[PDB]
Ligand binder design. Sequence first.
Ligand code: HEM
Length: 291
Amino acid sequence: LVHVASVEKGRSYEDFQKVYNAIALKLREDDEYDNYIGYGPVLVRLAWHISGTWDKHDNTGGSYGGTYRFKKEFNDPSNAGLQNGFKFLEPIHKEFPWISSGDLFSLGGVTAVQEMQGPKIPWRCGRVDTPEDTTPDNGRLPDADKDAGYVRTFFQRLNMNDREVVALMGAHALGKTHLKNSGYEGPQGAANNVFTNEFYLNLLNEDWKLEKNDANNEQWDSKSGYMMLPTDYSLIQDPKYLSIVKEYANDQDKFFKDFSKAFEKLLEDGITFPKDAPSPFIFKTLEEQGL
Ligand code: HEM
C-alpha cells in the first residue's frame, strides 16, 4: 500500500490558514463545552484517534483516508465521545468543502494545540479520501487498563520509541475522562485546556491512590482530585519511562519540542510525500494575526 500525498487542487498556504482560522475562531466562541473546557481537548483526541489506527506492517490505517467518516470507524467503541469533535468540524467542512477529511481532522488537532498555547506543530496537506472499504477494523486502538509493557509494545506498531511515547502522553494533561465514554471518571474537577507539562508534574508530585470506579475499573486518584489511567500511571513504574517523565517535569521547553515532533510524526505516519510537495506549513495563531 502506498499513500501518496496529493495537494488539494490549486490550494496554497493561505488557503490552509483560513481553515485554521475558522476552527480557531469557532473554538473561541464555543467555550461552554464540557462545562467550560472547550473543544480543544476533544479535537486533539480526535486527531490522535484517526491516526492511531495505523499499522506499520501493512501500511493500512492512519490519517490518510479520513475513514473515520465511515460507520465502522465512526462507531468504534474506542471512539466513543469523538462524535462531538466531528460535529464541531462539520460546518467548517461545509464552509471549505475542498479540503479532504483526513486533512481536516488532522488540522483540528494542530489548531487545538496551538490555540491552547502549546507549541507550533508543522503540518502537511495532501491526505486523500479513500473508499469505505479502506476502513480499518475496530480493535486497533489501545486499552487503558494495561501497563508499560503493553504500552511499549503497542506504540511500536506505530513506530514510536520511548521518548515519543512519553512526549505524546503529556497530552493527557488536557481535558478529562468521562464515565459514559470510556468507563473512567475525572479529574474530580474541573479541567485543563491550557497546554503545559502539568501531566508530568502531577504524576511525580501527587500521592496516588488505587481505587475502583463506578464502572468497576481501576484508576489512580489523588487527594487533589486528579486521576490517572493505569497506562498513565505505568510511565512511572517503568525505569525508562520514568527518567523521561522527570525530564519533562523539569523542562517544559524540552517537552514542547519533543511533543511537536512526535505529534507531526504521528499524523504523517503512512503517508508518502512526493519530492515536488510543499514544505510543511507552520500556521499563525489568531493572536498572531491580531484576530
Ligand atoms: C496508552 C495510550 C492511551 C490511552 C489508553 C488513552 C485512553 C484515553 C482515555 C480512556 C481517554 C478518556 C476518554 C473519555 O472518557 O472521553 C483519553 C482522553 C484523552 N486522550 Fe488519550 N489515550 C492514550 C493516548 C493518547 C494520546 C497519545 C493522546 C494525544 C496526543 C491522547 C489525547 C487525549 C485527550 C486530549 C484526551 C481528553 C479528551 C477529552 O477531554 O474529551 N491520548 N485517552
